[PDB]
Amino acid sequence: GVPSMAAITSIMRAQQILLGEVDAVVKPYGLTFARYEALVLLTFSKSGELPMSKIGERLMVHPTSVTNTVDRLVRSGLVAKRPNPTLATITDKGREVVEAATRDLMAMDFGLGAYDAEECGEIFAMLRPLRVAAGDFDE
C-alpha cells in the first residue's frame, strides 16, 4: 500500500493486540494496563509519592487521564491522595499488587513471547525517533 498507511495500521493493530493481552493479565487485580503503569511509576519515586502533574509528565499522559487513573487506584485501595503542601502515594496493598502483576506480565513477556530479543530490540530502535520528537527522552 502507501508506506505511511501501512505503518500506522501496523502500529495501531500491534497496540490493540498487545493491549488485549496485558489488560487480561492485570484485570484480576482490578487494573487496566494504564493504571498498572501509574503504580509502577510510583514504585520508582521517592517515598512512593508524586504530584499528579509529575505523574502525567513522566507517563506522557493528559492530566484528565491521570485524574481518572489515580481515582480508580484510590477506589481499589492501591493509592492514597492528599493535598500538595494533589499528591498520590502508593499504599502497601498497591506495592503488593504491582509486584504480583509485574511477575504475571513478565511471565507472558508482555504479549511478545513469540518474538525473539532481536525483534523486540528492532521495535524499540525503530520507534525511538518518533518518541524523541514527542519529548519522551528529555526532562
Establish if 24 lies at the interface with its own copies (CB under 8 A).
no
Q: Give the interface segment with its own copies, choosing from 3-11, 24-32, 81-89, 93-101 (CB under 8 A).
A: 3-11
Beta-bridge mates of residue 82: 87
Establish if 52 lies at the interface with Cl ion (CB under 5 A).
yes
Establish if 2 lies at the interface with its own copies (CB under 8 A).
yes
Which of 28, 43, 126, 139 is close enough to bind its own copies by CB under 8 A?
Answer: 126
117 binds, among its own copies, Cl ion, none (CB under 5 to 8 A by kind): its own copies
Which of 51, 57, 65, 80 is close enough to bind Cl ion by CB under 5 A?
Answer: 51
Output the CA–CA distances (angstroms, integers) from residue 96 to 17, 37, 73, 99, in the order listed: 27, 14, 13, 5
What residue ranges bind Cl ion (CB under 5 A)?
51-53, 86
